[PDB]
Amino acid sequence: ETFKALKEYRCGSYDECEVNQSIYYPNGGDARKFHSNAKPRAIQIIFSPSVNVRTIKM
Amino acid sequence: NRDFAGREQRLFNSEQYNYNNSLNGEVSVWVYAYYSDGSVLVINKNSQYKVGISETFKALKEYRCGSYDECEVNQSIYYPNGGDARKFHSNAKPRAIQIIFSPSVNVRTIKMAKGNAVSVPDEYLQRSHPWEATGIKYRKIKRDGEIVGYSHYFELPHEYNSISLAVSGVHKNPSSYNVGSAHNVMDVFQSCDLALRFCNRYWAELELVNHYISPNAYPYLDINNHSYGVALSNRQ
Amino acid sequence: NRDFAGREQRLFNSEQYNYNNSLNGEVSVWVYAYYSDGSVLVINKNSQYKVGISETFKALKEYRCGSYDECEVNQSIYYPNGGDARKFHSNAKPRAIQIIFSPSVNVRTIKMAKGNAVSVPDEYLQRSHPWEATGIKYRKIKRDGEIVGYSHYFELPHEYNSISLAVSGVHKNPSSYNVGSAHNVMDVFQSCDLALRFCNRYWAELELVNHYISPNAYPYLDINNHSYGVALSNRQ
Amino acid sequence: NRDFAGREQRLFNSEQYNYNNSLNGEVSVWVYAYYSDGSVLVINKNSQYKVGISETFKALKEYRCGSYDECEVNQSIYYPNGGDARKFHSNAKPRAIQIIFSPSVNVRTIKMAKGNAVSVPDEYLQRSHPWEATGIKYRKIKRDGEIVGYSHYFELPHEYNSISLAVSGVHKNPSSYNVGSAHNVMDVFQSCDLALRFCNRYWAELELVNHYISPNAYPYLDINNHSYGVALSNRQ
Numbered sequence: 001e002t003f004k005a006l007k008e009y010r011c012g013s014y015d016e017c018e019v020n021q022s023i024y025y026p027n028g029g030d031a032r033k034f035h036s037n038a039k040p041r042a043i044q045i046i047f048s049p050s051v052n053v054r055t056i057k058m
Numbered sequence: 059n060r061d062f063a064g065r066e067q068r069l070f071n072s073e074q075y076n077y078n079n080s081l082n083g084e085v086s087v088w089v090y091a092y093y094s095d096g097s098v099l100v101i102n103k104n105s106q107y108k109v110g111i112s113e114t115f116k117a118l119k120e121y122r123c124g125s126y127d128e129c130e131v132n133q134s135i136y137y138p139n140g141g142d143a144r145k146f147h148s149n150a151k152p153r154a155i156q157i158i159f160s161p162s163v164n165v166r167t168i169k170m171a172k173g174n175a176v177s178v179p180d181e182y183l184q185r186s187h188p189w190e191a192t193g194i195k196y197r198k199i200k201r202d203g204e205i206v207g208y209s210h211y212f213e214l215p216h217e218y219n220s221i222s223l224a225v226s227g228v229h230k231n232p233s234s235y236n237v238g239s240a241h242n243v244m245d246v247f248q249s250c251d252l253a254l255r256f257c258n259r260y261w262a263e264l265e266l267v268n269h270y271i272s273p274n275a276y277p278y279l280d281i282n283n284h285s286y287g288v289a290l291s292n293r294q
Numbered sequence: 295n296r297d298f299a300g301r302e303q304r305l306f307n308s309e310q311y312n313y314n315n316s317l318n319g320e321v322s323v324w325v326y327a328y329y330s331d332g333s334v335l336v337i338n339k340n341s342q343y344k345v346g347i348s349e350t351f352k353a354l355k356e357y358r359c360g361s362y363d364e365c366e367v368n369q370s371i372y373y374p375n376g377g378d379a380r381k382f383h384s385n386a387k388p389r390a391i392q393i394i395f396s397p398s399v400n401v402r403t404i405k406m407a408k409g410n411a412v413s414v415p416d417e418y419l420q421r422s423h424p425w426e427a428t429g430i431k432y433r434k435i436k437r438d439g440e441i442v443g444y445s446h447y448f449e450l451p452h453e454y455n456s457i458s459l460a461v462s463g464v465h466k467n468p469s470s471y472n473v474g475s476a477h478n479v480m481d482v483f484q485s486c487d488l489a490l491r492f493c494n495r496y497w498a499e500l501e502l503v504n505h506y507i508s509p510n511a512y513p514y515l516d517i518n519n520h521s522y523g524v525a526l527s528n529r530q
Numbered sequence: 531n532r533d534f535a536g537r538e539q540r541l542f543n544s545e546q547y548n549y550n551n552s553l554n555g556e557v558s559v560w561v562y563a564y565y566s567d568g569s570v571l572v573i574n575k576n577s578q579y580k581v582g583i584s585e586t587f588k589a590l591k592e593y594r595c596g597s598y599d600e601c602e603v604n605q606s607i608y609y610p611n612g613g614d615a616r617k618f619h620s621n622a623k624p625r626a627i628q629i630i631f632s633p634s635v636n637v638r639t640i641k642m643a644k645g646n647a648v649s650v651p652d653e654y655l656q657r658s659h660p661w662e663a664t665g666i667k668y669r670k671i672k673r674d675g676e677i678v679g680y681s682h683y684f685e686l687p688h689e690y691n692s693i694s695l696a697v698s699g700v701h702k703n704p705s706s707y708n709v710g711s712a713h714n715v716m717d718v719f720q721s722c723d724l725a726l727r728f729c730n731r732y733w734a735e736l737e738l739v740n741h742y743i744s745p746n747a748y749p750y751l752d753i754n755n756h757s758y759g760v761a762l763s764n765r766q
Contacts, residue, residue: 002727010144014596024730025741032122034096034262037149057720108480110487126360136494137505169484177340177492182511183320183396184310184526188342189488226487228480238479246483 008038067294075290078162081237085109085229086160088276090266091152093120097259098266099152105253107237107246108167110226115175118223120150121259135175135220152214158199158277159208159227165193167228170210175220189226199277199285206287207277303530311526314398317473321345321465322396324512326502327388329356333495334502335388341489343473343482344403346462351411354459356386357495371411371456388450394435394513395444395463401429403464406446411456425462435513435521442523443513539766547762550634553709557581557701558632560748562738563624565592569731570738571624577725579709579718580639582698587647590695592622593731607647607692624686630671630749631680631699637665639700642682647692661698671749671757678759679749 004020019036022029047056059065077083084104089111091099097120103109116132131148134141159168169189171179180186192210199207214221231237238246260266263280271278277287295301313319320340325347327335333356339345352368367384370377395404405425407415416422428446435443450457467473474482496502499516507514513523531537549555556576561583563571569592575581588604603620606613631640641661643651652658664682671679686693703709710718732738735752743750749759 002729017595020730021741025745028741032261035094037095055716055720057724108483108487110484112487112489112491114491114493129359132494133505137509140505167480167484169488171488171490173490176506176510177338177490178510179320179340179490182310183322183340184314184511186320186340187318188320188340188485222490222492224488224490226484228484236476236480238483239476243479246480250483250486 006040007036008040064294068292071290071293078160079230081229081231081233081235082106083162083229084160085162085227087111087163087225087227088158089113089223089225090156090158091118092154092156092263092281093151094149094153095120096262097122098263099259100257100266100270102256103253104256106229106249108226108228108249109253110224111255112171112224113222114177115220115222118152118221119148120152123259132175147217151220154211154213154215155221155223156212156279157210157225158279159196160277161205161207162229163208163227164230165196165208165227166191167226168193168196168208169226171222171224173222173224175222177222189224197279199279199287201285201287202289202293204289204291204293206285206289207279209277209279211279300530304528307526307529314396315466317465317467317469317471318342319398319465320396321398321463323347323399323461323463324394325349325459325461326392326394327354328390328392328499328517329387330385330389331356332498333358334499335495336493336502336506338492339489340492342465342485344462344464344485345489346460347491348407348460349458350413351456351458354388354457355384356388359495368411383453387456390447390449390451391457391459392448392515393446393461394515395432396513397441397443398465399444399463400466401432401444401463402427403462404429404432404444405462407458407460409458409460411458413458425460433515435515435523437521437523438525438529440525440527440529442521442525443515445513445515447515536766540764543762543765550632551702553701553703553705553707554578555634555701556632557634557699559583559635559697559699560630561585561695561697562628562630563590564626564628564735564753565623566621566625567592568734569594570735571731572729572738572742574728575725576728578701578721580698580700580721581725582696583727584643584696585694586649587692587694590624590693591620592624595731604647619689623692626683626685626687627693627695628684628751629682629697630751631668632749633677633679634701635680635699636702637668637680637699638663639698640665640668640680641698643694643696645694645696647694649694661696669751671751671759673757673759674761674765676761676763676765678757678761679751681749681751683751 003023007016015032016036016038018029018031019033020029022031084106085108086102086104087109089101099118099120101111101113103111115135119128127144128148128150130141130143131145132141134143168191170192171189173179174181178186179188196208196210198205199209260270267278267280267286270276271286275288279285320342321344322338322340323345325337335354335356337347337349339347351371355364363380364384364386366377366379367381368377370379404427406428407425409415414422415424432444432446434441435445496506503514503516503522506512507522511524515521556578557580558574558576559581561573571590571592573583573585575583587607591600599616600620600622602613602615603617604613606615640663642664643661645651650658651660668680668682670677671681732742739750739752739758742748743758747760751757
């Protein structure tokens, strides 16, 4: 997944487009906020027990 | 001793320091509320004799000038499962509070009523003292060796940290003249009407420092523990 | 007399009753405004020493979180035929008011200024006493033989019942220590800053009872004349 | 020969050049689509062993973050007079494409399937070879005598230039170790999952150069035929 694809989207934007521009390059965007709450705070990766753990790559 | 420009600059600054600390001067309080989006709400009150601020749970939540779901969030914060909200944690809730007093406060007079979300200081009204005297927790904001303000900082990092908040302080008065004695009590009543209030939301702490704290020679302590303000006593 | 769990439960409850009634405790007021849609607005204030609430005509009208015509309604209520409204009776006007005080109030201190829609207590300022002492009209809200609160209920069933409203009460004080004497008057001034306020609109009286009154051990008297609250003095 | 800062800087840069070109390093492709409003869409993919990009006709059209007529435009591009569109030429269609590969590609492995708007490489499926080997058309993007990338630029200036597009290249491998031999084929399958993709639309080529190409040390060839990138082999 891309940076943009991991951000929160609530089914049913302009400012968050600019947030992305300002995250790709410092001061690259014209955003109305310091920290976007749509950014993930954490990630958990889970594999099934059928994986071989020594093959996992990230 | 013939550098009169020098002597007068030092006196001009010292007079400012001392006037603020006189019974004729201001006492000021600020409440900063910090939101997860990095914005900061500031409420300020400036008055003679005594000063304070009191806000509801709802009034401390983030509002971006220029709702239905956040109404329901409030219902669900007043009573568990009382609302029909489409979210677990509202990002409009403050994550932290800083209370700052001017150096003209007497720290031993500071009082705070940090209530729950239905504005009860301590679980139930029947067992609530209406305030706590929190002065011992205030840190000195210092610049150049001078106390420029007093700060109390607290996080609300837990889901259950849903608060109403009032704070109050009395202007210092090392004299034995009681400003609330019969001779002047009507002046203190008038001071309640004369107090000026200010509130505004800054997009970032940088903007708060640059455009609110610094231009007005106010004291501040930032998230990095850095002190801001201007030292005036016996200083050029 | 060796059932210490029993003795301690009774003391815990009695201490709550007595603390609230001490000069260290809260005095509280609530104003309920009832609308024709069956919703209820509540305004609460909790403070030491004394407490009150003051609202404009406009502030008491129903507002459903999440206007042009209702602005004009106000113009037409301030002066007959002063507005260009598209309706005879606004359903946002309250149909009734109930004022409730905590049992820590002294009923003889209660004062009410029920003004007209331009906030004049009695027709013209020049002939207005600024309040009426209405304590004699307050009914005791009782549970289990204990006074848990005091209620004054009045309907506004007529088209001409368009009001502004303020109410005030003083915490009981059977001692001869005047809490507003010079020794403590600055504490009463601070109490004005420290008072916590709450306001919210409930969809129905059921929801008000279930989610506002009951969880907080507040007193209430419903439209059916049924009393709610919790008796604590010498009780398990 | 005792300027070790000098020797180490040259080695640091050379190691970067050589690592990228190793079987352990990245191979990267970019597709730039140029619109008549001067904006540029970039799609990038970075992977080990091999890399490519495949997009539909619809996916290459301009989209400005923050439709009905453009849906109909698509219908009228899939089949003549198939749509009910309110315009002759959609300005959302790209006017030109540039494909850039990293210098770690082997140019003789590059393949492109430039289809029609219904995603057929050559008029009808039945007579289509699924790709063309276009490496001979790629120009060397050079800085300071070093190949920093490879570019294929083509205009779509005609009304009938309505395309779907895929491009693919293999990381250079001058060894006789086949990275797709049985010993490592599962690693190449994993590389398909591990490839990272990026896409964004820049308002102007200036902004693309300033904020996308330059900060990331990527290669680029602008509309004026000027080369960008960073030469690293044996260089300080």
